[PDB]
């Protein structure tokens, strides 16, 4: 029949005898009210992973099958609410009021069902928008050592995307709920909770629910992507999902691989992350973009999980510790940071302004190393080092101060065309803000042309305005 | 029959058989008491915790007391609940073990006192509350570059022989004996010599009247060493919830918790993982540390010591616990080999509080700049070795000149270091620290010799020291 | 004849054929079920036999996800391996692992010729060899490790080094020149790059000269295993029965072996090496041997290989290294430095760097370049310890010219217009040799080192130096 008796219980796994007609992936329910997923079927005993606190489960307990595959409730009511990976409210405030349930075992958008990523996305950060542009539908990785700026950049991005309608989802995997509370409160404070959903997986909750969390997040997002919305999903630590699956595999007695992870690590993350796409015009035009994160010990790019996830994503933003403590924030290493959809995601004015900046910054870095070993350099090398030093200042930015795309191109054009020649490196940051104010109060028409056209204006008036501002600006 | 027989014994682990229909739960406590009928047989005083239900009426358990002398056919008793440690106000000024029994040789807690379980789920999302407020302990480095957070976790990371316990004791002194508030102390995996020295130091300081203690020690079987911290936590929980009183919870060398879990899992039959660690490293850790939080009803501040197994900081246990903390001080060894105590890494140490609007604009403005100058010193050493005077020039030379002065000033004389030199310690307040570092950065005192800046408390003392030495 | 499913553990299933007949290894089985009630899920599945068990039982690797499978399901035996539609019909179309087409443009009827994917390799008598250079227009490959027509080409690298940029550049130039049938099989790729490449091909019109088989990351391991064999099977017909010269492209071959390792533990194989299956080299050689040029036809095969942790000494890259005739190894340091592509000049090799193939002057120039680069490679460790003012005149000149050289190995690319916004260039071999001869002799010492970065021809170097104002 549809029921069976549990025969073993421990650490979240429970073999059962019976359950003759059970299907693979089917949800089952215990008398404790705790749900379970029937992952493996042997000849005479099912292997059940427990989706709740296992303390209440005993041998000889009956288990019943629901008759359906693993399903996550979805809808518009979830916006602004906090929920488990399962459809259970965590903030109280009554039920989640969801519309319908999407099976989370669905296939990805197939070949030729997509389109080239061309829709821009603005983080509000000069360095990221200028050097590593992101487009909608793209999957880009932000990676680095702990305490460097992962969640600061994710939250800055979510907050800056306030106008352009974008159903956003923020998945917390294996988190400390004080940080979940602080993130929720920052979203509410800056007025961004009204268009976000938060799914919570925390260490007190059993290990299987950490593995299900990003799957549930993407399954929630893909409802809005199928109906035609632009969507965003954030995974602030995929590394903790890897560990959860490593736990789940070993408890089922399965051999390891490199490091200690099993071989299915690539399959799991690829199965997850392939569901992000920019659907074709025949499908509706939705654009789900994912922003996963992984933490690398000692800031090491060359490891099993880091390179595993790097091979599945369309770009790298590398956060480096000694740059962070040197005062360069946000700390991004030009060399190891690049995007594989670059060029399309930038508006044409930005491309005309700066398209060689990243390569020239990596050249500045390697030349700084060569100067570190040597004593002194020739005149043109001095000039190159001088300009490369200035490029770093123009990309410094303070926390929680977003900038629109139009303002960036002014300062980047000033930098690339050599207008920061007479300004010492100490005064560059002051120059930036004074230039912002001067263009806001004197040179509005150029910014108007940029805003309406989406292209660079006639440079004569721009050059005259910059010269006039250089007349206004006082040097220390 | 409610009672159950013992089928197998293997080290700490014991396998009990219960009649069908009367099996215990996962975290039940079981008791064994034996009447010896033969000269060969021995007296038994044993209680055990369930771990797994391994099917066919059999249950696998973990030893809390040593299993030597066990026999097959003995009768186990099911308490139907966990250890149920007695708790209340009765436990103030007493020393216990993991089972809830005192070891201070004073008396027996009455049989009608209320007792509560050790295992229970953590505070929910709605019940937590968040604020950042400084706790001032007077240690220059930790109060300038990484101030503590009331209601938050603090971690002391270091190897063997660095000073973690010296820091613990110094914090107990400076904070508890000059701020007040209920304290609980759990010695975990420590030399039992220090379980006596702390007792006597607190009594001769006169502070035991408002603290409780639990000790498990290395000697005990692996299960007790891990359950001890949870007993300390279940003690503090009653203070914070039912009495509504804030708690300061001290735990020493928390690594022994993971190490004992690893050993117990190896006994249990779980497959290995990582560097011999159990599969459930972060699940079993997170279940513990998620309960140490500040709800709206009351708060727990915890100061903990994390021992790094070797030179490798990237060991799974130090790495996984780093995700749970709020402020951390990492203890250097090369500074300790230079005698610059306390050997705290001024660049690896972190705190959630160091922000221009959480700890003060001026404090942050000086702190981040000093950290920048330290990072500048770190990278710039090579040019000095390779070429010396005519490459260490101009601004780098001046940076080195002031950085050498400011490097030693992070050192301070300690109260618990009176054994090592003949002079007492000093508690240095925040304002003085912030002003003193600034006065160094001005060059106001850079003509003083660099060695003077060691093991003093206020910037005027450095002029006094330079006059006393005549250098 | 039918068999009952009795076990299922992820990718692997365990059918029992109790009728008195059993399938052979590599055969294909079918599951087609109609849901009897609202709880059951309708399923259409195929399984390939991988191992024979004891009692009327076989271990079968599933080709698609196994959800909904119930013990006691009935399995049909097709009696033959996986069949692939073979002919001129494959040109233009895109297919999946089982042989069905992926684009919506149509269907393939029953009358089409279909061939099994598993068969023995060519014998020793059939092979043939030649030395003819295949010009690429890429300075590094052309001057330091020339490719050869009909020779296996290997691109080795870890994640994010420049492998697929090189694949696209080579496919653009070669498909511009060669009148060859082309087969493109993507194993374990990003499913977005497949669509992007399809649209680029449609812009180029090469789609009529190309046949494509696609299986990517989102697929269970069995399809990832068999996709490269399907693409090879098509290239086989084109090479032999038509007698037409063919090109076979495969990007990141590794996932063929990775998928085999993942299901290996489920198949009862004891572990080996770094988690790999015991049968690694047998399977890798079995695949690689079938890709050969015979007298009947020739296959120019260009392959890209991925390293699990970027350690070239990893078992899988090490086994593959023996099957190549030219290899370019790309490693992250050059990518960090800004020089592109990331090919290592002193570890990329080909069977064609010999005066009897490339001529005396070319060989001398290449070897002298490599000598200068090795001298600087040791001088970096010397200079770190002693400083840069303790070296003598000649030791300083070595550093100067090595710096001038490794920049000139960087080239403005065609497909890198999106990434850097530059036109692109095609550099003839003679011009590369002339420029490098000018460099080694010190004819361009006065130019600053920045002038040599990301340019096609030495004339563009002089133009960029003129732009710098020198
Ligand atoms: N523009 C900026 N200017 C200055 N500081 C910044 C800026 N952006 C981010 N930061 C700093 O970066 C840090 C971000 O910490 P956060 O908690 O977001 O990190 P995380 O990597 O997500 O988490 P964890 O370290 O807990 O794993 C903070 O110290 C914040 O002050
Ligand atoms: N403030 C100090 N001033 C001078 N020397 C000190 C100071 N603190 C510690 N030391 C020296 O370093 C040693 C530190 O010993 P301690 O037991 O505190 O280190 P530990 O290995 O971190 O501790 P444990 O392993 O017991 O947790 C002392 O024995 C003493 O020699
Ligand atoms: N010639 C070049 N000029 C400039 N940038 C380049 C060049 N070649 C590659 N890049 C940059 O490096 C990135 C490398 O991406 P690519 O698809 O080539 O990776 P890969 O080596 O195939 O890696 P993976 O195995 O992870 O797919 C490109 O997206 C681009 O940003
Ligand atoms: Mg974080
Ligand atoms: Mg100690
Ligand atoms: Mg690829």
JSON list of N, CA and C in Angstrom, two decimals, chain B residues 18-44:
[
{"chain": "B", "resi": 18, "resn": "UNK", "atom": "N", "xyz": [15.64, -2.88, 24.29]},
{"chain": "B", "resi": 18, "resn": "UNK", "atom": "CA", "xyz": [14.37, -2.66, 24.98]},
{"chain": "B", "resi": 18, "resn": "UNK", "atom": "C", "xyz": [13.29, -3.50, 24.32]},
{"chain": "B", "resi": 19, "resn": "UNK", "atom": "N", "xyz": [12.32, -3.94, 25.12]},
{"chain": "B", "resi": 19, "resn": "UNK", "atom": "CA", "xyz": [11.19, -4.67, 24.56]},
{"chain": "B", "resi": 19, "resn": "UNK", "atom": "C", "xyz": [10.42, -3.79, 23.58]},
{"chain": "B", "resi": 20, "resn": "UNK", "atom": "N", "xyz": [9.88, -4.41, 22.53]},
{"chain": "B", "resi": 20, "resn": "UNK", "atom": "CA", "xyz": [9.15, -3.69, 21.50]},
{"chain": "B", "resi": 20, "resn": "UNK", "atom": "C", "xyz": [7.99, -2.91, 22.11]},
{"chain": "B", "resi": 21, "resn": "UNK", "atom": "N", "xyz": [7.86, -1.65, 21.70]},
{"chain": "B", "resi": 21, "resn": "UNK", "atom": "CA", "xyz": [6.80, -0.80, 22.18]},
{"chain": "B", "resi": 21, "resn": "UNK", "atom": "C", "xyz": [7.17, 0.13, 23.31]},
{"chain": "B", "resi": 22, "resn": "UNK", "atom": "N", "xyz": [8.43, 0.12, 23.75]},
{"chain": "B", "resi": 22, "resn": "UNK", "atom": "CA", "xyz": [8.86, 0.96, 24.87]},
{"chain": "B", "resi": 22, "resn": "UNK", "atom": "C", "xyz": [10.21, 1.62, 24.61]},
{"chain": "B", "resi": 23, "resn": "UNK", "atom": "N", "xyz": [10.55, 1.87, 23.35]},
{"chain": "B", "resi": 23, "resn": "UNK", "atom": "CA", "xyz": [11.85, 2.45, 23.03]},
{"chain": "B", "resi": 23, "resn": "UNK", "atom": "C", "xyz": [11.93, 3.90, 23.48]},
{"chain": "B", "resi": 24, "resn": "UNK", "atom": "N", "xyz": [13.09, 4.36, 23.93]},
{"chain": "B", "resi": 24, "resn": "UNK", "atom": "CA", "xyz": [13.26, 5.77, 24.28]},
{"chain": "B", "resi": 24, "resn": "UNK", "atom": "C", "xyz": [13.44, 6.64, 23.05]},
{"chain": "B", "resi": 25, "resn": "UNK", "atom": "N", "xyz": [13.62, 7.94, 23.30]},
{"chain": "B", "resi": 25, "resn": "UNK", "atom": "CA", "xyz": [13.82, 8.93, 22.25]},
{"chain": "B", "resi": 25, "resn": "UNK", "atom": "C", "xyz": [15.31, 9.14, 22.00]},
{"chain": "B", "resi": 26, "resn": "UNK", "atom": "N", "xyz": [15.63, 10.05, 21.08]},
{"chain": "B", "resi": 26, "resn": "UNK", "atom": "CA", "xyz": [17.00, 10.18, 20.60]},
{"chain": "B", "resi": 26, "resn": "UNK", "atom": "C", "xyz": [17.92, 10.73, 21.68]},
{"chain": "B", "resi": 27, "resn": "UNK", "atom": "N", "xyz": [17.45, 11.67, 22.48]},
{"chain": "B", "resi": 27, "resn": "UNK", "atom": "CA", "xyz": [18.32, 12.33, 23.45]},
{"chain": "B", "resi": 27, "resn": "UNK", "atom": "C", "xyz": [17.98, 11.97, 24.89]},
{"chain": "B", "resi": 28, "resn": "UNK", "atom": "N", "xyz": [17.36, 10.81, 25.09]},
{"chain": "B", "resi": 28, "resn": "UNK", "atom": "CA", "xyz": [17.03, 10.35, 26.43]},
{"chain": "B", "resi": 28, "resn": "UNK", "atom": "C", "xyz": [18.28, 10.07, 27.25]},
{"chain": "B", "resi": 29, "resn": "UNK", "atom": "N", "xyz": [18.14, 10.20, 28.57]},
{"chain": "B", "resi": 29, "resn": "UNK", "atom": "CA", "xyz": [19.16, 9.75, 29.51]},
{"chain": "B", "resi": 29, "resn": "UNK", "atom": "C", "xyz": [18.74, 8.42, 30.12]},
{"chain": "B", "resi": 30, "resn": "UNK", "atom": "N", "xyz": [19.68, 7.48, 30.17]},
{"chain": "B", "resi": 30, "resn": "UNK", "atom": "CA", "xyz": [19.46, 6.15, 30.73]},
{"chain": "B", "resi": 30, "resn": "UNK", "atom": "C", "xyz": [20.37, 5.95, 31.93]},
{"chain": "B", "resi": 31, "resn": "UNK", "atom": "N", "xyz": [19.93, 5.12, 32.88]},
{"chain": "B", "resi": 31, "resn": "UNK", "atom": "CA", "xyz": [20.68, 4.88, 34.11]},
{"chain": "B", "resi": 31, "resn": "UNK", "atom": "C", "xyz": [20.95, 3.40, 34.31]},
{"chain": "B", "resi": 32, "resn": "UNK", "atom": "N", "xyz": [22.13, 3.10, 34.86]},
{"chain": "B", "resi": 32, "resn": "UNK", "atom": "CA", "xyz": [22.54, 1.74, 35.21]},
{"chain": "B", "resi": 32, "resn": "UNK", "atom": "C", "xyz": [23.04, 1.74, 36.66]},
{"chain": "B", "resi": 33, "resn": "UNK", "atom": "N", "xyz": [22.44, 0.89, 37.49]},
{"chain": "B", "resi": 33, "resn": "UNK", "atom": "CA", "xyz": [22.86, 0.68, 38.87]},
{"chain": "B", "resi": 33, "resn": "UNK", "atom": "C", "xyz": [22.88, -0.82, 39.13]},
{"chain": "B", "resi": 34, "resn": "UNK", "atom": "N", "xyz": [23.98, -1.33, 39.67]},
{"chain": "B", "resi": 34, "resn": "UNK", "atom": "CA", "xyz": [24.21, -2.77, 39.73]},
{"chain": "B", "resi": 34, "resn": "UNK", "atom": "C", "xyz": [24.50, -3.22, 41.16]},
{"chain": "B", "resi": 35, "resn": "UNK", "atom": "N", "xyz": [23.82, -4.29, 41.57]},
{"chain": "B", "resi": 35, "resn": "UNK", "atom": "CA", "xyz": [24.12, -4.99, 42.81]},
{"chain": "B", "resi": 35, "resn": "UNK", "atom": "C", "xyz": [25.11, -6.12, 42.54]},
{"chain": "B", "resi": 36, "resn": "UNK", "atom": "N", "xyz": [26.28, -6.06, 43.17]},
{"chain": "B", "resi": 36, "resn": "UNK", "atom": "CA", "xyz": [27.34, -7.03, 42.92]},
{"chain": "B", "resi": 36, "resn": "UNK", "atom": "C", "xyz": [27.09, -8.29, 43.74]},
{"chain": "B", "resi": 37, "resn": "UNK", "atom": "N", "xyz": [26.92, -9.42, 43.05]},
{"chain": "B", "resi": 37, "resn": "UNK", "atom": "CA", "xyz": [26.69, -10.69, 43.72]},
{"chain": "B", "resi": 37, "resn": "UNK", "atom": "C", "xyz": [27.94, -11.56, 43.83]},
{"chain": "B", "resi": 38, "resn": "UNK", "atom": "N", "xyz": [29.00, -11.23, 43.09]},
{"chain": "B", "resi": 38, "resn": "UNK", "atom": "CA", "xyz": [30.23, -12.01, 43.08]},
{"chain": "B", "resi": 38, "resn": "UNK", "atom": "C", "xyz": [31.41, -11.11, 43.41]},
{"chain": "B", "resi": 39, "resn": "UNK", "atom": "N", "xyz": [32.44, -11.71, 44.01]},
{"chain": "B", "resi": 39, "resn": "UNK", "atom": "CA", "xyz": [33.68, -10.98, 44.25]},
{"chain": "B", "resi": 39, "resn": "UNK", "atom": "C", "xyz": [34.29, -10.45, 42.96]},
{"chain": "B", "resi": 40, "resn": "UNK", "atom": "N", "xyz": [34.08, -11.15, 41.85]},
{"chain": "B", "resi": 40, "resn": "UNK", "atom": "CA", "xyz": [34.58, -10.67, 40.56]},
{"chain": "B", "resi": 40, "resn": "UNK", "atom": "C", "xyz": [33.88, -9.38, 40.14]},
{"chain": "B", "resi": 41, "resn": "UNK", "atom": "N", "xyz": [32.58, -9.29, 40.40]},
{"chain": "B", "resi": 41, "resn": "UNK", "atom": "CA", "xyz": [31.78, -8.18, 39.89]},
{"chain": "B", "resi": 41, "resn": "UNK", "atom": "C", "xyz": [32.10, -6.88, 40.62]},
{"chain": "B", "resi": 42, "resn": "UNK", "atom": "N", "xyz": [31.81, -5.77, 39.96]},
{"chain": "B", "resi": 42, "resn": "UNK", "atom": "CA", "xyz": [32.16, -4.44, 40.45]},
{"chain": "B", "resi": 42, "resn": "UNK", "atom": "C", "xyz": [30.90, -3.58, 40.54]},
{"chain": "B", "resi": 43, "resn": "UNK", "atom": "N", "xyz": [30.95, -2.57, 41.41]},
{"chain": "B", "resi": 43, "resn": "UNK", "atom": "CA", "xyz": [29.86, -1.61, 41.52]},
{"chain": "B", "resi": 43, "resn": "UNK", "atom": "C", "xyz": [29.84, -0.66, 40.33]},
{"chain": "B", "resi": 44, "resn": "UNK", "atom": "N", "xyz": [28.63, -0.26, 39.91]},
{"chain": "B", "resi": 44, "resn": "UNK", "atom": "CA", "xyz": [28.43, 0.54, 38.71]},
{"chain": "B", "resi": 44, "resn": "UNK", "atom": "C", "xyz": [27.54, 1.74, 39.04]}
]
